[PDB]
């Protein structure tokens, strides 16, 4: 969907309505903590809205042109065994971004950083809105500097007439209750989001593609925006319950992948063009290393980069991973020191490592996170 850097536009409307939806569907018997956390969210509305639009204008990334259209089955294909060269990190998808920002949002909320938590939640919903955008051509036709397309700008001009204020039921009813049953957040998110994304693809072929009439387009915007709002409300509801009842999705399950969220210091020359790797060592002495390389310019000064690592051994618990590290290898003979500011490691929807560093890493050296 379309959006503007100041927290306005289609994206902002979606999260704003997601809140109103909850304000209306929330049953009276709901735990007061849930209702109280909803109120904290509402008073941080401007941050939720800013976060909901930020990913299309994020300048602390890889210096790449924005393109947020993925085939709904991408995440599922990446999750399958054998289908990926493990030495390489897995590319970020709309599906994975929802999970990452959700984990970061939960972590921040538990420690009282409501403003940051809400912003992160906004970013998670931004990506959910995207996968719910009915635009799936093989070849994209961008119309603005932020990578938006004509179907999104069309919906943008009409956003007000697509607003909904209810999911169609109360939180004690099926839609909402089903969302709480699956205690495995990452597993629930995958199936839940995939449903909206696939319906989105169907709508692209039957109503939103360029060859369809304006009437078809209006209808497509209407039904996918309703879906986006409802779906967003569902994610916010789950977040509220997760942070209120102190829920942890990683609870004793196998760690199939690890996600590194690395914040490079804003200091001059903090970034690096040298080869960068991440590695772990298990309690039993096993080791695995991955190359941290995404399509763009990795580890730029002041960037917040994400790397998804798929593990060899799929029978490991989080406590089985004893050490973790990042390692630099010189690209050229010339110096190019690297200064990470903070590194967060996420395992099964939980932020398991949050280490401030602010030290220069130079030459061919290994820096131990743990
Ligand atoms: Ca670089
Ligand atoms: Ca790269
Ligand atoms: Ca440098
Ligand atoms: Zn969008
Ligand atoms: Zn986007």
Describe the structure.
The protein is α+β, with helices and mostly antiparallel strands and 370 residues long. The chain folds into two domains: 250 residues, Orthogonal Bundle (P1 Nuclease); 120 residues, PLAT/LH2 domain (Lipoxygenase-1), CATH 2.60.60. Helices cover 40% and strands 15% of the residues. It has ten helices and eight strands. The strands form two sheets. A four-stranded antiparallel β-sheet has the order 4-1-6-7, covered by helices on one side. The protein has a four-stranded antiparallel β-sheet with strand order 3-2-5-8, with no helix packed on it. A hairpin with a 2-residue loop joins β6 and β7. α2 packs across α10 and α3 packs across α6. The radius of gyration is 21 Å and the shape is globular. The structure holds calcium ion (3 copies) and zinc ion (ZN) (2 copies). The site of one zinc ion (ZN) has 6 residues, from α6.
CATH class of the largest domain: Mainly Alpha
| N/C terminus separation | 40 Å
DSSP helical segment count: 10
* Number of strand segments: 8
Ions and ligands? calcium ion, zinc ion
Helix content: 40-55%
Which of globular, elongated, flat, extended, rod-shaped describes the shape? globular
Number of domains: 2
Binned strand content: 15-25%
Class based on secondary structure composition and strand pairing: alpha+beta
Classify the fold: give the CATH topology of the largest domain. Answer: P1 Nuclease
The CATH architecture of the largest domain can be named as Orthogonal Bundle
EC number: 3.1.4.3
Domain PLAT: 256-370
Subcellular location: Secreted
GO biological process, one term: symbiont-mediated killing of host cell
């Amino acid at each position: 969907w379309d959006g503007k850097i100041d927290g306005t536009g289609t994206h902002a409307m979606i999260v704003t309505q997601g809140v109103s939806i909850l304000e209306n569907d929330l049953s009276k018997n709901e735990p007061e903590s849930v209702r109280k956390n909803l109120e904290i969210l509402k008073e941080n509305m401007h941050e939720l809205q800013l976060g909901s639009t930020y990913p299309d204008y994020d300048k602390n990334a890889y210096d790449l042109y924005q393109d947020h259209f993925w085939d709904p089955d991408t995440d599922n294909n990446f999750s399958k065994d054998n289908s990926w060269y493990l030495a390489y990190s897995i590319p970020d998808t709309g599906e994975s971004q929802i999970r990452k920002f959700s984990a970061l949002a939960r972590y921040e909320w538990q420690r009282g950083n409501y403003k940051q938590a809400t912003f992160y939640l906004g970013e998670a919903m931004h990506y959910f809105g995207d996968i719910d955008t009915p635009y799936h051509p093989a070849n994209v036709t961008a119309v603005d500097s932020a990578g938006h397309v004509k179907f999104e700008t069309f919906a943008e001009e009409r956003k007000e007439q697509y607003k909904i204020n209810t999911a169609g039921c109360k939180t004690n009813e099926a839609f909402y209750t089903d969302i709480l049953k699956n205690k495995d957040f990452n597993a629930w998110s995958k199936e839940y989001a995939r449903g909206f994304a696939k319906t989105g693809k169907s709508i692209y072929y039957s109503h939103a593609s360029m060859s369809h009439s304006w009437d078809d387009w209006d209808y497509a915007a209407k039904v996918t925006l309703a879906n986006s709002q409802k779906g967003t409300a569902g994610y916010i509801y789950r977040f509220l319950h997760d942070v209120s009842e102190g829920n942890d999705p990683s609870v004793g399950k196998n760690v199939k992948e690890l996600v590194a969220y690395i914040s490079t210091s804003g200091e001059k020359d903090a970034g690096t063009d040298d080869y960068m790797y991440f590695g772990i060592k298990t309690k039993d002495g096993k080791t695995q290393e991955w190359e941290m390389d995404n399509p763009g310019n990795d580890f730029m000064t002041g960037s917040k980069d994400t790397y998804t690592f798929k593990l060899k051994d799929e029978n490991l618990k989080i406590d089985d991973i004893q050490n973790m590290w990042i390692r630099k290898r010189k690209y050229t003979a010339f110096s190019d020191a690297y200064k990470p500011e903070n590194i967060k490691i996420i395992a099964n929807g939980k932020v398991v490592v949050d280490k401030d560093i602010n030290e220069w890493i130079s030459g061919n050296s290994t820096y131990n996170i743990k």
